[model samples]
Target chain A: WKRGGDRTNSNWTILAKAGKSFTAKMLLLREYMQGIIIDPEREYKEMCRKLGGVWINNPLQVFQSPLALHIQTLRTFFSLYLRDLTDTEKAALEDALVEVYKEAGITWDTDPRGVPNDKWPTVKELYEYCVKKAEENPETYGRLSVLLKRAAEGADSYLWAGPTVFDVHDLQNAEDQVKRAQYFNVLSFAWNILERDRRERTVLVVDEAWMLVDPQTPQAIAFLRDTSKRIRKYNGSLIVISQIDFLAPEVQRYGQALLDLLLAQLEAIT
Target chain B: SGINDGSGIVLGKDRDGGLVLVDIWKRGGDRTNSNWTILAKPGAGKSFTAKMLLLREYMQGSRVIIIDPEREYKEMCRKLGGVWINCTGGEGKINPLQVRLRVFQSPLALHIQTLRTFFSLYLRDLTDTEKAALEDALVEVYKEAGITWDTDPRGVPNDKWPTVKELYEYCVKKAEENPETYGRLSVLLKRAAEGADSYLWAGPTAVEADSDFIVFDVHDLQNAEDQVKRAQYFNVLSFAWNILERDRRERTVLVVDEAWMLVDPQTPQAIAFLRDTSKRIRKYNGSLIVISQNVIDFLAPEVQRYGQALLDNPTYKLLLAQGEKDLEAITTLMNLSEAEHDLLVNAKRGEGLFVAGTQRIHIKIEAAPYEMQY
Candidate 1:
């Protein structure tokens, strides 16, 4: 993996150890491979530009992926949006996510990768579906609409409402005022490109991974967990570089599970 | 995003043949100090590595001074228009009694302790009566020169201060009472007052701090007596410390080549003085490079405590090729790995370990054509 044959075989989860020459070795990792970094604070924008990689500032860029994984990601996003979800609330949110795709005439069996960008429903249509179903069950769908309206309406509408247009692979979310919602979206979209080609080796760097490491942000935790679990299958490596101590004493069960996954990566590198 | 400054002085190439740049002043936020040390056997490019470091640091606007015992730096010093003083008891007189008024409080009071250390190294062992008699005469010479603890030394000129010759004359006057004690002191200090050794400390200090680079060449004193050489080395180092403490803002480097001469088998204060300077040099924007040929003497059972601190206090260390026993001594002290110890055992000339504050790299010393001439 350092300087040997077949650099792609060593691709896996690399939990950046939190001591001594990390930033220097981070650049050293890029020296050996072509990487697509999700820079939240535009930290890597200058280096990315110098390396002749694309710099995508807008977070609403689209990719052609199946709708099944999109729906699975939607459930994770709603859990992050509501902070916590019950069995009944999860059922209503799952039903609403399916109804939005059905209203757009796209089902699980259909290939949404072949569909045009206009027919793909956004968070605005998801909020509209919640608004219509709230009349039937106000307790379940009413809670989802109040929170989903923030993503569907003003200020964040350009981020979550419109159909993706630009072909942005290296996501720069510095223009976004928030962190987890758009961070999760960009992280998911980065995996879409990784999964599109297993033969191609890529390095995914999340600069501000600490923003997603909170007790309230379970979806971001699960997003990282799922990526580390399935990244080897895509021949990709995931690296999270943040100065904050992510393995401190005050984490929960799910947080410890995420820490365990990272510890394995740390052991592999050592 | 990387701590690789990419702008410091390039010492040489690393193991992967990349340029190894070291910035002792700008390590990271948790830097310890700016001191450096080099331990290598002879003909291992020890002097070459040291001279290159001085030349590069001089280029970066640092005032450089080297106490060269072998005159190896004369070529580099003259080529750069640097001042070179022959420190063989004939030139570069440094009065140990000179007071630095502007640099510290109670100048003579603070200086009495420093003179005690210098005199101890000069006279070897002083009894209670001999030591007290020497202090009395030492204080009387300053009083006779109109310089005292109460008086402002800054108001007086540098040439008017008491010299070692004056201290000897004062001891002659005091010998009228006790010939057994002060009489013996007069005969002993007479070597430093008149005769061949008088030029070492007879007059006021001719060394000035005006030059950007200065080399105190002591190669002529190699055949001199051991105690005399150690005493003069201590004298020259104290004078260098004066130049370092004079300007608090100017970045200065005081390099002591063949530093093993200062660590005595009997007199531990000779090495203790260097340890004290290594500890406080950073406060005045100063750095000290202690280069020696062997680590075995510094780690001797007698001088181990002070000598170990002298080696350990520097935040940076450049270890070149070593003898087998010398390698074992340093490896145990510095905690070198098996590979690091092997690198030293099989090291070529100018190739060994270069350690900054927290990072160490195997460095090969290379130079430009002009620098290679020296």
Candidate 2:
């Protein structure tokens, strides 16, 4: 795991001594979820914790908490949806999508007399193809246009992890509040115990989670619904601490759905 | 659609035999829609005409990509130092998963769907559950192997992407494990994997025709699920698209003669895609021209709206004369007020009109009169 098995806590550390192999992998994953700088390896002493050795063998268990998944989902959305990409990456994505379309056998032959082949069509051509399909025959392959756009889009990239990512998005411009909810949907979906699928004690505290769970995005509502209905069997509790009533109308519908199961518990607590 | 100087390839002379003539293909070569179409019956020298023009384009530095259904162009490719690659499921295996990898609009999902359609051709009538599970496993196989949705479909050399057989085997293992919920699919996959019948997109791509003058002579499986013909043809074109789509720009002349084989609206949802791409080909600096057997395809009342729109979309058109018996039913579809209706019916050999947008140049095919200024 490292140069000359150096951890003095030996048996407890597992390969905790490895320099790049283990730490870098965890860092990339952290970039996927938490805002950078949290250094869970340092704060949680997770890198050297007694149980950390076992968890290393089961990395999936290391991220069993819903909050981690939630942040994981958030960070993914931010890195992907939040920025523009270089034309090179954009074109690569666009071409790849077209490649995907062709591979899918989803081609419309504009080639009839077998004209001299030029390069592949532009992203605009592919996007228009998708948009028109959505318009004329959304039922057939119209909705597929959206997927096409997704595949056709340029790939996203990220920089070093910055823990302030969630914080920055929280107090953004007034107009951004509505915009933020759309991406927040991914986090809600990740809040459920998709991994391991067992009853566990992972607590999800969405502090003023309304910022992340607004119904502006369907996935947001889906996460709330999905987590509420099926979470019991997983023995997972979704603890959302919001102002409770100030949510926008669309978000309220989903918030109530999640909180309804404990409606009476709320009264007793008061 | 790069324009090439064809002075070297085109052979030409006047009817009165005076000045030698030449044809240059400025395909996507310029800032205009240079897409062309040649409409004539089988013996109308469609390939003969397209070949000379393609060679002309080739001489000018345009990479010629041909989709030959009959491999008729093999000699021409060899004649020009280009690759005339033969394709079937066997030899040069086409890797369906290879694409410029790395995406999040979930290019991975697109790969899964592609595997689904490709598998659909290989495996017949997958039940809903079977289809989903197979697709999941296809993605799973790739993901399990570390080639993911956005992973560059153009795979890394050392890390070979999983083959179709492996994918099906995974399905088999899954179904073998849970015979009740997914067993049927495993049986289906097993049947598909090793059989009297074979697989289409299984291993790493065997032959990649990234040659200067590329002709994908597809030959295989005429007898499988329906449209096996069009489906295979689609991959070659897509591969062509993949090659051309890459950065470093170059002149390209793609001639998929007998073009109707590429798509049928009833069979697949690509007509609008066809029409849409044709109209915008100019934007990509590429031109798309489509030719068909008859105006009948465009004249059918059901497809009139579609074919009419598409037929008129090509910017550069080689309009050959149609027969009286047929033109009567389809005279209006040709929109040849630019061309004499009689000129078409009485069309003699090498006699046709080149319609470039609204301009019409009398086309007499001899030597290389491929260059037209309408």
Candidate 3:
């Protein structure tokens, strides 16, 4: 399960207790991971201690550097993987990040890997790793293609990304590329590794998937509708929860077509 | 149905098979397939009883339509789910479907025009002389517009005239512009616009008389004179008659609270309409419930013709405490024994005598629990 916002700490604690209770059924339990992607890293450690969940990255130690510079470095590297941007644009982004890092009193040869000495790696390095891996493996590209195609038609914004990385973004693009890439990457990874037998029982859940499309954007309505269709594919099911019935009226009108199609398939299968 | 038990409440089975305890001021069975009068002075629970009867039908979920002159039924309907069309206040104006030429100053302008319209339709059937006579009467009415009437009746220009509803709307607008004229005209037009059909013209589709609760609250005209009261009453009576005539077998209950003002002898036309229409109420499986403070006070010499019909048709009669004269009159009218008469006089508030349909037993009545604020 993925959690965010002010209640994240308390929620993590609850989930930890629940995880502890599942010891008796340990063999049956699925893999579990806890991660926080918040600024002001100190709070992340505090939350980790409170919830007794492992911290994937130590954000607090990074706060020792100028916050804006750290964020800018991350922003430039992740911008390269944004699918809408060209290779030239991605190279330009990397150059900008390198310059920003050098200006921040870091030597170019200090770490050839471009990974920061601080506990957390720079976002540029993460993007580089993903791009290099994608280049090296034809299977990874094929998987990403399948995931993006699924995302283009899904009901949930996160159906392509998964829940935790739902809103992540890189600075190279005006939009949130980190979140988009994370979603595509996770989905691609799942599709590539999952055996046919295991795929039937695996469930994917996305939180606030509606946020993928900005309400004020011209493409909001169309984007939402397209995303909604794709999320309905997982025979195991995908659940989209929202606090308000704001979309209920629209859903009533357009959702019928998707439901009809799904019902036809189910009938045929049965 | 059981006896009132000397309490001011009358216990009986309502239309819904539930035990109904009505106060002496309220008569339950009076709402039958007949015309009945409930006489009570002010503050005698006339409105309360009417509300109860109307509410009972509403609870049963009947579609009720009410034509109100005084706007009293509007609030009663708010409690009970019924629509009330008020024709007294600014929002209560009625617009006729067809054009109505008003001879500027004549008080009889509308009446004369209506008669003319009726005659014009059948002119082919009338003799030339007869037609001439009708034309003469029309001319004479027009002549009175300037002299006898307060306004002119001459060759008035035909402007884009407003409907009755539009006219009321115009009056409302005019009132906003000129309060004095609006007030004066409202008082004068109040009498002319009292009846239901006159306020709202009878359309090709008949009026629906199938509401569970039909309340015509005339509380707004409490200060009007006998003539105004009579006109308003006749309007209600005519509307009710039209509805009953449309669907004679549909079970309905017509409630008129503060009924004494309109049922008097002076309003012969109104009283006649009531007497005549009461017979048809049950023909449509309906009941007419009239409520007032003083039953005797509402009884005009004209009502004497149908007094027995009113008394005998009610299936139920309740007598509550009032002055000694009212008690004495009720006792004599009911022909109660000395012990029964004494029991009625000594009964406490919310207590009374009940006479069920065709029953010889005198029942003691207990008042219903109060449910309304006013």
Candidate 4:
């Protein structure tokens, strides 16, 4: 992991731990660096608590940005859950997000530093905004709200609602698709924090990153690829751990490109 | 530089803005037969292109018939003053036992094989003895109607044709001797003979294909069970064939939209009948248009024998915007050129490659101002 003898060059690492204790050892080695682990299996709960890091069951409560970027992140999240979205549907969702953010006194260009974190809107507000829009233009937003209802009021709402009370985000209780969406949601929040303040060095560990790499949802892998490429600029690193064979051919094409961009790779064949 | 045949109708415009005239009747250019296959994903303007072709052909004095599984063509069919027959509602009574006169083979023998295919679609499986017993029951009903292998079905009246009830009655009589075979067949045939499925074939033929344009709307059957839908598809397909064979002088085009409903792993005989029709319809101055969104499923290994024949026999093919997985399958199966591959992969709605015999042109489907209402 030495390129020009610079530690920053080894910022984005792809870890394939075919055996045990590799993730634990890497977390210990990168302990000095501030971090957030999207622990889908709750395997890192004890380790996360031991290391003085936070363990959270739901990341949604902590990531209520209501920014334009959040809208895109949410769009990608819904795409992962719904499999796909039509152009009309995407446009409707974007509009609903803008309205929801506006109702919370947030706009695309509004500075987050001036707004209270508690004032940020949640997916429930977005659902209500869409519900209002549906009454006005049901042809467009009626089906959209129905699709968004899963995240707004359904069982998955817990991932996006409530206060940030947990320390470590353990997504073991969520459904497979809900886990992937929440994993993406957590990554989006981690990236937002890392990009906004470069003073602190951080390493974002995405365990079971294959959950975010899906052929049906290319935007998810694309988000991963872009995050891997840009994290180095913000004094940040991304540790993506998953089996290489878990990705599909279409997804692997981008996943391989992401791997090629990594500062280092560790493969184990146990 | 172009097809000068007066019978030719414009499909749309080519890349160079020249009108693409396709004469479905004549053999010219690379087109040896008039059959066509329209392949595309949903919302790729497949039904629109198909409708444009039918509208043009109908306007040109050619007869048009469509087996619509999704009701996508009913508005156009009704607007064109065409006859719309809904089979699921019992509006088009096509008795499977109604044997029409044939040119070469005996009508009864040809119809017995068709009945075998129909029953295979419904029952899914049959033993050798069970199939032979079914043939015996079928022949017994025809004999009861005073018809046989030597009889001319054209000379018989409409009411004289035996229905499924008569066939079931014969099965009941024969089952007394062999319950293991005919008894089993009768139990299975009970649905079509006296049960809910009886409304489809228990009566005489009441469908009037007299109009030049007729649409057999099997759209309601979309929600039905697979076996019921496939069996009904076979029934409507045979009825449409009867209309096509009724006149050798008249130019006819039979469009089977959502044709995947008729092709199944359990019933290759249905696909074989469709393929066989594609081959023989040419002699009757007719064309077969097979429209489907799932071309990948259409060419699956299980039904490939006859399914592939039905697709390959079509002289003309319209390749439209395909789903990612389907594009891969079509690329390898059709041996598409690099440019053709690019065109299909990135094709917009109403834009695709129109293959006519040896000539393949990148074409965009265009509609007249008045045609847009439908």
**CA displacement after TM-score superposition, residue A191 of candidate 4 (Å):** 82
Worst 10 contiguous positions by lDDT, candidate 3 chain A: A8-17
lDDT of 2 by residue, B1-374 (tens): 12123344433333344333333234433324666766776666667777766766666677777777756688887777887666674665566656432223444554554455555544555555565456556656865677643355454652377765777688767654445435666666554457533455555677756678777777444454445566666666656655655533444665666665654444333344356545544555554546555556554554456666666656667666665554564456555563466666677766666554555545566653443310
After superposing candidate 2 on the true structure, give the runs of residues whose Cα lies further than 4 Å from its correct spot.
A1-270, B1-31, B100-110, B113-131, B176-192, B196-199, B220-225, B264-267, B270-291, B294-311, B321-334, B338-341, B368-374
Which lDDT tens digits does candidate 1 get at residues A1-270?
342465533333335544322453455455546536766555556665676657777221221224434655766665555665554456556556656766777643355467677777777887888888677556556766776787789556676677771123233443322455567777787787788767545667666566666555455676786786577566556665553235544434444454442422243233
* Candidate of highest DockQ: 2
Interface RMSD of each: 46.1, 16.0, 47.7, 32.8
- Candidate 1 or 2, higher TM-score? 1
> Which candidate leads in lDDT?
4
lDDT of 1 by residue, B288-307 (tens): 89999878889988789999
lDDT of 3 by residue, B2-84 (tens): 43323433343432344454332233444334344454344444444445545545445433444444455677666655555
DockQ, per-model, please?
0.00, 0.02, 0.00, 0.00
Q: How close is candidate 3 at the interface, in terms of C-alpha RMSD after superposing the true interface residues?
A: 47.7
Order of quality (lDDT): 4, 1, 2, 3
Estimated TM-score per prediction? Answer: 0.56, 0.52, 0.37, 0.56
Compared with the true structure, the alpha-carbon lDDT of candidate 3 equals 0.39
Reference-based lDDT, residue B302, model 4 = 80
Fnat for every candidate: 0.00, 0.00, 0.00, 0.00
